[PDB]
Amino acid sequence: GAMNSSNYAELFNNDIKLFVDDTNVYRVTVHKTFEGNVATKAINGCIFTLNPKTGHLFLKIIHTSVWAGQKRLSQLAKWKTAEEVSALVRSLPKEEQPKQIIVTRKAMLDPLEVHMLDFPNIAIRPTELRLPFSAAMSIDKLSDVVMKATEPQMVLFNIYDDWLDRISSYTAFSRLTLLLRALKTNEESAKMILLSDPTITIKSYHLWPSFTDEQWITIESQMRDLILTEYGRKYNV
Amino acid sequence: MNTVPFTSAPIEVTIGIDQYSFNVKENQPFHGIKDIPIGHVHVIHFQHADNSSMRYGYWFDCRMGNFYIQYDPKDGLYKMMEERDGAKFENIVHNFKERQMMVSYPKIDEDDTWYNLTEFVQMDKIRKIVRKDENQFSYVDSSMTTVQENELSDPAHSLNYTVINFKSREAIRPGHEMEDFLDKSYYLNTVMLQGIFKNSSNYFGELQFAFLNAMFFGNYGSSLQWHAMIELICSSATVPKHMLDKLDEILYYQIKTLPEQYSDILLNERVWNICLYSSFQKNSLHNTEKIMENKYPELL
């Protein structure tokens, strides 16, 4: 059934599963026309498909061309996401295909279910968790590759970098969502935190700086503090 | 005009016939229903005074033979049976009339209600849904399940309704995934109309049978089949104009005949709001919309 804080630790058993996040599929700017009416301009977006156990990300870039000549785009976005998730599932060897796909957003269920008819034994699940994967475009290398694309494209990343070498999935995922939750609530601040010290660099094949074990603790503490500060501000507590 | 005699009335029961019904007392001398219009299907049904659960009854058609009702004490229920001895049957019917122990199918000549309720229902199609081919009439009750229900147990007692599933390979042409789930015209017109039902009248008859089974036995899977068949149409962008105007009549009379107190279990809020206000056909059900609002404003 639905995914929540009860059944949180199923994410890290050895059943292959993927999260799918569609929030960044159809992205627009909103601007005024010469006649003073409102009009939107689309930009490149991405499907956020992530194996929480392993960190494998299947960043499916959605090129603005996809939308050319299309109506009801926000609705089409869900159908495309589902179309593209299915094709990713078909492109993978059977023993790599997931047993579950969890969508971050309930509106994705029917489109995905429909597109997965050919995979009846793959369960499509909603979630009640409030995950922060919409903040994926606040990760610089990820927003760059999305923005620079000229054609539909898939880019493969590991969203944990090399962390698993030293920590477990559960912990990897908790760091990942902590960072994104901070990026979501106050991007400027969260990024200041991460990049302040110029002597801690980002490896070319990585997304986050190469913090030592000690430094990761300071960072996580600072991301925590950030997030409580912004909540106080939001609600005057 | 045909007659359905009763051997006896051993137990207290409310008997129904089509949309009419009568209370009959334990060992009241009651010996059948007469003046029953030939030319449509009928259904005689039963609710014992002791077990208000399990309503049950028999669909039939006097043209297909001579039928009567006899209470079986081992099974504890009223059973439909066929007398094959023509003379022997007219003999019993004439005697009981003379003794006047029968009630008259009480049709007001202005009333097209049963015909409207049953216009497209044909016995031969019913016997394909209630497979029991050693009888010419068909038994149904409150608790019988459908085939679709059985997939998601005993198949002799199955309601073999035609299986409709919006999220199945049947309904969804590969490559037209989004198209066909938002606009079910394909499923309705080619797969279901032209493919499985052959014509719109078989569809409508099944639709209408399913509704009556829900109404008379509170058969829950039948209520489900009825809504899915309405839903499929309402969710199709492209429907033959005659089917639309016939559906609007069909539903008017189904909504008009429903007992007022049962609107809550029998009417699926989502499908109705979709049909009347959301779907493609929002504008094509003018009589059904008017009767729903003025009789059941709340459900919407």
UniProtKB/Swiss-Prot annotation, chain A:
Segment of the intact protein contained: 1836 to 2069 of 2413
Q: What is the effect of changing R105K?
A: Severely impaired growth. Reduced growth at 30 degrees Celsius. Strongly reduced growth at 16 degrees Celsius
Native species: Saccharomyces cerevisiae (strain ATCC 204508 / S288c) (Baker's yeast)
Additional free-text comment from the UniProt record = Present with 468 molecules/cell in log phase SD medium.
The places in or outside the cell where this protein is found are: Nucleus
Q: What is known of its domains?
A: The MPN (JAB/Mov34) domain has structural similarity with deubiquitinating enzymes, but lacks the residues that would bind the catalytic metal ion.
Ranges where the record places region RNase H homology domain: 7-237
Q: What does this protein do?
A: Functions as a scaffold that mediates the ordered assembly of spliceosomal proteins and snRNAs. Required for association of BRR2 with the spliceosomal U5 snRNP, and the subsequent assembly of the U4/U6-U5 tri-snRNP complex. Functions as a scaffold that positions spliceosomal U2, U5 and U6 snRNAs at splice sites on pre-mRNA substrates, so that splicing can occur. Interacts with both the 5' and the 3' splice site, as well as the branch region. Has a role in branch site-3' splice site selection. Associates with the branch site-3' splice 3'-exon region. Also has a role in cell cycle.
Q: Which domain of life is it from?
A: Eukaryota
Where are its TM segments located?
none
This protein's assembly is summarised as:
Component of the U4/U6-U5 tri-snRNP complex composed of the U4, U6 and U5 snRNAs and at least PRP3, PRP4, PRP6, PRP8, PRP18, PRP31, PRP38, SNU13, SNU23, SNU66, SNU114, SPP381, SMB1, SMD1, SMD2, SMD3, SMX2, SMX3, LSM2, LSM3, LSM4, LSM5, LSM6, LSM7, LSM8, BRR2 and DIB1.
Q: Which residues form a coiled coil?
A: none
Name of protein:
Pre-mRNA-splicing factor 8
From Swiss-Prot, chain B:
Highest taxon in the source lineage: Eukaryota
Which residues carry the post-translational modification Phosphothreonine, per the record? T257
Which segments carry the region annotation Leucine-zipper? Answer: 244-265
> What is the predominant subcellular site recorded for this chain?
cytoplasm
UniProt KW Transcription regulation keyword? no
Keyword set includes Nucleus: yes
Keywords linked to the UniProt accession: Cytoplasm, mRNA processing, mRNA splicing, Nucleus, Phosphoprotein
InterPro entries registered for this protein in UniProt: AAR2, AAR2_C, AAR2_C_sf, Aar2_N, AAR2_N_sf
Task: Give the UniProt family note.
Answer: Belongs to the AAR2 family.
Put simply, this protein is called A1 cistron-splicing factor AAR2
Q: From which organism does this entry originate?
A: Saccharomyces cerevisiae (strain ATCC 204508 / S288c) (Baker's yeast)
